[PDB]
Design a protein around this nucleic acid. Sequence first.
RNA 1: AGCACAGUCUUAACGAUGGAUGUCUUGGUUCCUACAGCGAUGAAGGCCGCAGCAAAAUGCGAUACGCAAUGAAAAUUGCAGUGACUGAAUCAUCAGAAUGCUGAAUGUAAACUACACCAAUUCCCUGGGAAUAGUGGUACUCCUACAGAAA
RNA 2: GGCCUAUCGAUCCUUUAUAUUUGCAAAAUGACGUAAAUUACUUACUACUGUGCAUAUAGAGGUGUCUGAAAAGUUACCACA
RNA 3: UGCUAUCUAGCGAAACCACAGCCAAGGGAACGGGCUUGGCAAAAUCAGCGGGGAAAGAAGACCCUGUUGAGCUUUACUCUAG
RNA 4: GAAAAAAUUUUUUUUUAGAAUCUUUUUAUGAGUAGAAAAUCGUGGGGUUUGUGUUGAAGCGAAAUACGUGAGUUUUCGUGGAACAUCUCCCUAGUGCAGAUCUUGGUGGAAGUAGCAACUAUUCAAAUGAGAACUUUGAAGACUGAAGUGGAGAAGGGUUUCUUGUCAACUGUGAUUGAACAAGAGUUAGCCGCUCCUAAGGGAUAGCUGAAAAGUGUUUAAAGGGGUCCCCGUCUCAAAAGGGAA
RNA 5: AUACUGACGUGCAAAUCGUUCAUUUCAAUCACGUUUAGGGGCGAAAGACUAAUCGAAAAGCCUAUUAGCUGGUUAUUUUCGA
RNA 6: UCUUAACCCACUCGUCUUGAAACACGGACCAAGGAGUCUAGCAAAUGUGCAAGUGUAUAUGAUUCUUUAAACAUUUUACGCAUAAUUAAUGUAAUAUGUCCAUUGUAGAUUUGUGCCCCACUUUGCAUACAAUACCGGUAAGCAAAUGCUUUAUUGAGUACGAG
RNA 7: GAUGUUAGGAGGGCAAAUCCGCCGAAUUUAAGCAUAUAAUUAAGCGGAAGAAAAGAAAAUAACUAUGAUUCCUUUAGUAACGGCGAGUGAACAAGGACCAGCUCAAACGGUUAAUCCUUCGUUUGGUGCAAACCUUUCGACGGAAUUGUCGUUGAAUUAUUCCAUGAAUGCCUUUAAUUUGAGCAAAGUGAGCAGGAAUGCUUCCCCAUAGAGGGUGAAAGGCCCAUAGUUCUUUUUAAUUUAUUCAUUGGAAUUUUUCAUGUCGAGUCGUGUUCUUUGAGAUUGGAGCACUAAUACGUGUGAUACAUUUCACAUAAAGCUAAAUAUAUGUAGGAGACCGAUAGCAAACAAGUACCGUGAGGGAAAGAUGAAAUAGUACUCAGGAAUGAGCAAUUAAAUAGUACCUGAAAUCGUUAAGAUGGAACGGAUUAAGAGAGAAAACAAGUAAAGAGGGGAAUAUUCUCUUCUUUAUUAAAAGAAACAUCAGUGAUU
Lengths: 121, 211, 244, 147
Amino acid sequence: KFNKQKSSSRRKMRKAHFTAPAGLRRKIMSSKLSKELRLKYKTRSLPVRKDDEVLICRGHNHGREGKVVKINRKRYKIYVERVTREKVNGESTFIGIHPSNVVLTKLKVDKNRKKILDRKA
Amino acid sequence: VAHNNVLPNVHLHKWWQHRVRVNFSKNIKKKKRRLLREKRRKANGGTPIEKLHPIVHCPTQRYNFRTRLGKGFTFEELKGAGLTPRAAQTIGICYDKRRKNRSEESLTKNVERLLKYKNSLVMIPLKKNKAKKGIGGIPADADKNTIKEFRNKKPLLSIFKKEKNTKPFYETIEVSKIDKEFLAYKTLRRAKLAERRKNCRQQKKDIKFKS
Amino acid sequence: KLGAGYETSAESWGTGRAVARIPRVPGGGTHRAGQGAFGNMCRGGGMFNPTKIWRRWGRKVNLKEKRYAVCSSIAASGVTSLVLARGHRISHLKEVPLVVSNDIESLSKTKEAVNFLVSLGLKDEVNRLVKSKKIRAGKGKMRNRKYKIRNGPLIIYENDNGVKKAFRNIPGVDLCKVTKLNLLKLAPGGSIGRLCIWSESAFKKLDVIYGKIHEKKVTKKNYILPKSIVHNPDIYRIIHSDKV
Amino acid sequence: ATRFKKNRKKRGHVSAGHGRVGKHRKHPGGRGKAGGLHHMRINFDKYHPGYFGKVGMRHLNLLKNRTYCPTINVDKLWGLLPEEKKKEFSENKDIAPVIDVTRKGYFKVLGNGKLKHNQPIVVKARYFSSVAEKKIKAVGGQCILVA
RNA sequence: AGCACAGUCUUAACGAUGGAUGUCUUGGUUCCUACAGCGAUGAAGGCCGCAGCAAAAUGCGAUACGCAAUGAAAAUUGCAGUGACUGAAUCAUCAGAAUGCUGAAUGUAAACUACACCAAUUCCCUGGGAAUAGUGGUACUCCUACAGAAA
RNA sequence: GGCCUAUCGAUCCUUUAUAUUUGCAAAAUGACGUAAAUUACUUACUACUGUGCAUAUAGAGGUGUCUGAAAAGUUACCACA
RNA sequence: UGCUAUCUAGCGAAACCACAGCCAAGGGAACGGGCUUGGCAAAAUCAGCGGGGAAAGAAGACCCUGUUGAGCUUUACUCUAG
RNA sequence: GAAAAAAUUUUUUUUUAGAAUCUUUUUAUGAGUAGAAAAUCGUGGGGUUUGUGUUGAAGCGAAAUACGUGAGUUUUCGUGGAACAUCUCCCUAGUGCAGAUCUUGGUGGAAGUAGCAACUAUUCAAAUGAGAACUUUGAAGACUGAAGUGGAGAAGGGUUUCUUGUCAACUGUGAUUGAACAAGAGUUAGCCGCUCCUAAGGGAUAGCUGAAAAGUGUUUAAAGGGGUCCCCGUCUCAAAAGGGAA
RNA sequence: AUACUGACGUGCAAAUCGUUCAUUUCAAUCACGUUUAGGGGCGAAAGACUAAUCGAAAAGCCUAUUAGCUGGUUAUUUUCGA
RNA sequence: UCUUAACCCACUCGUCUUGAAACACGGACCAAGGAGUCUAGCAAAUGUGCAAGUGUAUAUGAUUCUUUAAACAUUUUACGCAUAAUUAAUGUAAUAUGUCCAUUGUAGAUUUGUGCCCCACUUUGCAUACAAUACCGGUAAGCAAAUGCUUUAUUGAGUACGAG
RNA sequence: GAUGUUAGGAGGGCAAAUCCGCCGAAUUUAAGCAUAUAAUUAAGCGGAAGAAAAGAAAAUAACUAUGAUUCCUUUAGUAACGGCGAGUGAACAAGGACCAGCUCAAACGGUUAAUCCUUCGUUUGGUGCAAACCUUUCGACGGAAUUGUCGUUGAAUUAUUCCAUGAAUGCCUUUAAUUUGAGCAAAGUGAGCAGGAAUGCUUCCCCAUAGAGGGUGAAAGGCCCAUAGUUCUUUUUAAUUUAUUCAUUGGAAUUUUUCAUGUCGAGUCGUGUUCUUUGAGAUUGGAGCACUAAUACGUGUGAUACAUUUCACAUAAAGCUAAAUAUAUGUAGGAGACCGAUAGCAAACAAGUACCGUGAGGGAAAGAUGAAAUAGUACUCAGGAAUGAGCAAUUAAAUAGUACCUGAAAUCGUUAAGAUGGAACGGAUUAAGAGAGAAAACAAGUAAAGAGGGGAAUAUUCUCUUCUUUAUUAAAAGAAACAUCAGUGAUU
């Protein structure tokens, strides 16, 4: 609002949204943390990582929990183990889920994650 | 041209379309000027950046009554003040080198204005805590308690602006102290008429003096 | 754009070969070639009159007129019937101008402000403001004019302690300093009779500003308020009268 | 502006108020003021008579401030004085008001109007009319030539 | 399992055809604010290259879609292929290193990979040993200094 | 002015007339006139003040395509509206 | 006589086109395919043809006009290189 | 400020106007190009007001016992799938089309027509393939007729070459063909050319002019070679047919 | 490139094709390279030619040149109306 | 509502032209785009604010800082235009001063009275029109010892209780 | 003056929106045209910068005078210039923005050039990881220059008062601004309904110093990034805080008193003349040429040629200088009462491209499936193949299948209905067909039993209500028709 440094246009925000560097991609691949965990870490939302365990809260796939398979940064879609779908030829792939639609249960711990948690708390 | 319409006086026959300019920067330019001077003053410790002019006469028949801010005090007024040119540069008074200080009344008024400023002025120590009597008719170095106390207060910068003049000028005079004698219209015409006779006489006076 | 609709060279091969006498684009294999070059009827032809910054966008709005508009709008804001006509939900309000104590000026939070509006009786007005968040249609959207909201209270304040920060970020509610009143805020869409909420500080300062106590810096320099042409607008009472 | 225009009244009308027979074309007598005396002589003679010719000597650099002339009539001379002050002068036979017209911005006092009879006033100015002078003497006032 | 008239024109219904209309919009547009020169220490421009599979604008320059370094920092992925559990895989920053041939272009040339001349040259090792026909310099004008000649 | 109804010409320009009327931009050019004064930049008082140029007013010098361009031919080589 | 035309199979345009498309006379912008009155007038076509469409084309090259030109010439005006 | 009807005085049913560019009433009037005025209606955007949205709006086609003298407005069904109004008031404008040999884009009638007419001619059989007048093989018939539809080379083009595939479009017929498309392959020099030399020529140095840009080119020079410090000297590019080792 | 004012004249072609005819040892023809550039060149003279361009080439600009002249100039009702 | 019928009537629209159904010109067709505008200065109109003033110019100022690129403010002889005309021009310049009443007529809006209200007299008498005087600047003429004068002529966009 | 591939250096060229120079037109206007006009504009050739140039009086005034430059408001559409026609046209003052001064040069200093530079070196500081920069005095050895560098700004002389100076010890404290990158950053992914799936609708919660913006399977303050708010770290520049002793050398300013009264830019000014230019007018500026000066009590100015004389003001012919001010190009932000794919930049895109031109040059057409193709047409059958169809199949949706959104009109196809003797359509008025409709275009109330809803009395008793349903009495409304009037005709 008050700052005149950054544009309030639709146009700049969209271009920034599409041309993202990796840290920005990581920011907009964050998900909301579980309620006791939010109290524990003092943190609303966290960037997704490989072995995280999420619960789906939106779409036809809502109420399903599960581990994250692969994250697709380019299409901004995470893949989870029990959201399979067969394709036109019957090949099974995982449904890609935008990270807005999932709440994170058990985050994966690692050295980088520890540093992030230390930074946050 | 047709009907009751006045003859035009426009000059748009030349290629004016690349010789035209429209001001859309005005209020922001004004803001920028304000910002620039404010920043400058603050950088100078908040000390005045204002320039104190001599009072000088506006010229010719039309404006001779009026008086305005002039270019600079110059040597005779500075000498009457007891201030050096170097001091005049050092302090906030305006500087010059070729404005003559003219008549007595104007000089006397401007030395009084200089004296008013000179009395007004307080000067911060040059090196801080190594106080001296110093040069140029500039004040001797201020003490630490006073200068700090003064720093907390507003500067008094009223004298920089032009002064006002007599508000009513409707004054009384008793009937028996005035007279009906005068012939002003006659006096004017005669004065212009007798100019030639005097000019000739004065030229002869000037020749005699020069001899 | 200055050169737009005119940069191309232009040519005329159609006169003596039965094609209309507007200029045509020269060249061969390009499919611009032989097409109508420019002129306001043409593809690529630009404006009939090119817009320029020469245009008289602004106006001189005169000092006495400006003052009169502010004073008269404030007087109009006064009138209870006009407030309701302007669409303010006036029903539970308890005075004709809405005047609150000095103690208003220190209020500190959006909730406290909402509580105060509810306490005044403007809950329904606050409901209309919340409702009035709607998308503005057409090309405005592409030019970042996304929502339109309606206009409720105008808060007139002297002291800067809380109200300024508190009534900031309240949808549809406006703030103004007593000296620096704004006709654009007092009468949106040129509509007389906006709901005005005053501090006692503000109300008293207003009286000083436009003449009272003769305060040298606060007063507007030798300003005199206008007087009505009609002394009393109750014409029907004149008609009713015995002499009449 | 655009929505009230004459073009909006005449929008589908061909020549559209400029003459179907005429078939409207720009400056058809020639440019600007140019047809004056030649083709527009009748207009210029009837509406701007003294336009053509050369009259008088020349003064190469005029310098208008040299000959500057701010006037007042005697009629408005008393008007430079406030009402209550004027009442005091009316009351008190023994005194007259001095008026510095130059300090109020004027150099010449002219003779239009009335001075109230039996009521002295002192008028200070650079220039006075013969009539103004006569009135000031007549009413028992004084005139002051002043620079 | 029969029965229709044809052709032409018109009407309604349903389609083809066509790309208008409507809806968008990482683009334009004008204004205001802000900083604002590169080059023989070889710029701009132009070629010629360079991707594992690679043609292109893009990107980079024989170390070539990046090298080093810093800050982020676990993936990458059309296929193949390359890593993690934090100087590796990925970005961004980018100061170090590197920057073919040209081009003012400057050894003589120029529809030329044509042609001079002077230095032969480089690396490794701790004051010596090995490699390579390779690499530089040498334009025109000016200036200061020096030189040996000419008052 | 011609017994009446005809016998004639803008602006700019030039030219000669005319004036107790004017100007040439800080000033002056009769005349140191008339008085006094006499150390001198003295002091009053005066309708009539150099050459040249500019005005102002009044005529005249001309525009006969006569309510006023300083303007010869030519195109079967021709072009355009 | 050849080659075409013709007919089939195949591929496959354009100029042109206010709406059109039988006459006669009349009046009319004074020579009508449509108008008024008369003659009349009955699908669909194939092959030709040149009476008409004041047929198609190119903003009358002719002529006249423009205070648009351009070219050229002279003892036209005004200059000017030499 | 009370009129009527229905019931069974009382119950029930309808109505009951006061907004000045306004309402009631009366009489007169009603042509129209060029032209002037007023009242309207619509489009883009803005403020304002109070609404409409995916229990499908706008948009679009077809309509409606619809309303308006009219422009239009309103609405239904069908399609459609996201944003739409303001007549409450008022500002603003790239604001209203049938036409301009209009601009731009698409499309017809003309029309399965004009046409595919230079250059004497093909036939039979077989093979391939889905399919053969015009592919391939053979047999015939013919023609070009050494100023050749034959060989070579220059300009110019530039992988068009060649093998191996091949048939969406192209190859103005057909097409399995192809100079189209796809994947590869391929041009080897001491001696052949260029490259070298000078010419007609061109560009400069030396000068000199010209504000410079340029115009000139040994022409008022302290300049590349041979010699035991001496004797000579404007340079440079310019021929793929002149000169020129093999 | 003389004639058939041949064929062709929405071409094979924005000048072709057929037949006829002129030229053929010199003021010959051909190539390549070269020179001379726009009010300029060059011309066995026709105002010829100077890249489908010429009584003044092509390119770009002054320029949206100018045009008393040609064409076009956009919803509705009502009123006065030449 | 659509649809044919049938009786009666019904000439290609636009266009320039006195005159087009034309043997006058443009138009094969459909869709989209497609032409009195903008700036400067001026005028009258009407609204609005103020009035012998008016505008606030450049600019300053602020407890003004998403929208604020506007809005708000301006510590008593700045300037534009209007408050005076005349005129080549030095220049000159508006009742005439015995009176704070304040030019002369004729119509003329408005008011008192008489004989609810139109009335019929009288009564008072703006705007405005038609005139008239005055008086000022120019110009004559007459005078002129310069405080230039003088009845009379003429002339200005004049002036005779300010309107911008 | 030559010569040097001697040793060290510099220039060249490019880019151009604004800037500075030159050189330098015409279309156009006058309704013609010649002077004037376009215009000291365009093009040409040069030079610069983040601004440039201009600038410290050979100035303006005639006042009670002002006093470097630039800019604005203004004077002013005025003085003035002009076939005095068309047309052109300043400056000074005033109000302001903003303001900054100076040095060569003569003159002065000779018991000594007190100067300058290169090369060689050498040390008192300070950063940085490292590269490396930054201060710092001291000596050489070369040169240069007296045909003039350096110092001095009249000359001494008095008193006053400051500044440079060097050493020791002391001391670098605290904040305030200012400005970067950085971070942290409020509440729900709660019912229920319909939905392909909410960010919808409800309904129960809330948070806001964040209800700006963007993304997120339909409109989100509470889904995410962001935002408001803050915590630091970064830039510099203010305040505050602290200095104390001991030491030489040097300079400067006033102030007395004497004494020195010197000085001030030449083929330049000026004048003539010519051509140009302007406001310049019997010549404003420039330029060519001719003639060619005076020295400070001079000579340059005071807008009409001149002579003769005043008076005021200035100090040419050498030089530099920040600021306000301008900026259509490059880059970076921020914008909008702008355009919405025939528009907007020629370019929403693999466009300054393709393509065309001998070349200089000229120069396009060209966006959108869906929420998700990590949902992009599997499978079967008939086909030589293309393709087609499917009981098969993704999707919420395939007359949604990548020439994919919506999909108008022209155009053309299928079916049905009508019409059809040299046009076609129309107007006015009926007709027959073919469609559509019940909203005025009939039926209030009453009784019976279903579905809902309300109000009162002190969570539920009383009571009021509307729709479906069975049938049961009204009635009104229009169209006809006749009669009756009143108005207006015609008839006998």
